[PDB]
Amino acid sequence: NLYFQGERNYNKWAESYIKYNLSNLKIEKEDLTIYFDNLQVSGNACVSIRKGKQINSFEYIIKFEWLYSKKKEGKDYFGGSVEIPDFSTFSLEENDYAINIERTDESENLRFIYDSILKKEGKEKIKECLKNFQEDLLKHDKNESNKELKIK
Amino acid sequence: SSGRENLYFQGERNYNKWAESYIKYNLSNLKIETIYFDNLQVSGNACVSIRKGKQINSFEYIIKFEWLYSYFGGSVEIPDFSTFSLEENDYAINIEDESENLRFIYDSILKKEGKEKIKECLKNFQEDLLKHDKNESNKELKI
């Protein structure tokens, strides 16, 4: 009945958005670039219209990997995993969701990268990357409205 | 029915003038060669909407006219020219006259060839309605 009442499922769009944004996110330092790959995005996204207003609900687990380039030396390395277990309408509003970052091994190089860049700035930049999700979801929803009711 | 449709629905476009003019113009210009058609009355409604991502149409018409051979020959009615009539072109046409002249022509021409020609004339009505509505939208795209 929700579909007949105008709710639309945007899981494919949301998966694509989250993948695109994080796979293009680069954290640029003096001698290092942090980047991301291998994005699993699992969950749901939908919007309906109630009395002229968009009502949205989304929730995602985003699990991916982080890597780094020794910028001045032209070598890329695997770093570890990143898990955002609860990226949702509720957790986005307060921008307070967890980002759990792990290192692939116990080496000194990765500890330095994690401590110096990832644990604070890296998390900050990931959140900045994702912060417009709800606004972009709503714009996507508007074009679905166009597709169904305005395009001949 | 949904909040989405209530906000964004662009309305039920009415094409009464276009539909009446199309039926009238096409039937008035139809000859069987000589049998002609005159005195056209076209009564009804036609509409096109965009819903569910597609053009949706409906129409419902009575069409009345007279036929002449050249002399007044009589009258014709198409009682129900409607939305799904042109899928199979299997709507009724009533053709009506007591002389032997009018009888033979009715039996030898109007009954089969007359009705086939009338139906052929009108068979593209729905397709042409949809194309008219599309070009009515197109009108706004280069302005």
**Opening angle at CA A144, ends B49 and A7, nearest 5:** 95
For A121-151, give the DSSP string: IIHHHHHHHHTTHHHHHHHHHHHHHHHHHT-
Q: How far apart are CA A22 and CA A5, in angstroms?
A: 33
User: CA-CA distances (angstroms) from residue B7 to A54, A119, A150, B10?
Assistant: 11, 45, 12, 9
Q: How far apart are CA A34 and CA A122, in angstroms?
A: 8
Interface test with A, best of B1, B5, B6, B8 (most A CBs within 10 A): B8
Q: What technique solved it?
A: X-ray
Q: Is B137 on the interface with A (CB under 8 A)?
A: yes
From the list B1, B53, B55, the residue facing A148 with the nearest CB is B53
Q: How far apart are CA B34 and CA B31, in angstroms?
A: 7
The DSSP bridge partners found for residue A114 are none
Q: How far apart are CA B106 and CA B69, in angstroms?
A: 11
Q: For chain A, give every domain's residue range.
A: 1-152
The DSSP bridge partners found for residue B61 are B44, B81
* CATH 3.40.190.80 applies to domain B1-143: no
Instruction: Determine, for residues B7 and A52 on separate chains, whether the beta-carbon distance falls below 8 Å.
Output: yes
Q: Is B111 on the interface with A (CB under 8 A)?
A: no
Q: How far apart are CA A3 and CA B136, in angstroms?
A: 31
Fold classification of A1-152 is Bactericidal permeability-increasing protein; domain 1 (3.15.10)
- What is the CB neighbour count within 10 angstroms for residue A129? 16
Nearest chain A residue to B54 by CA distance is: A152
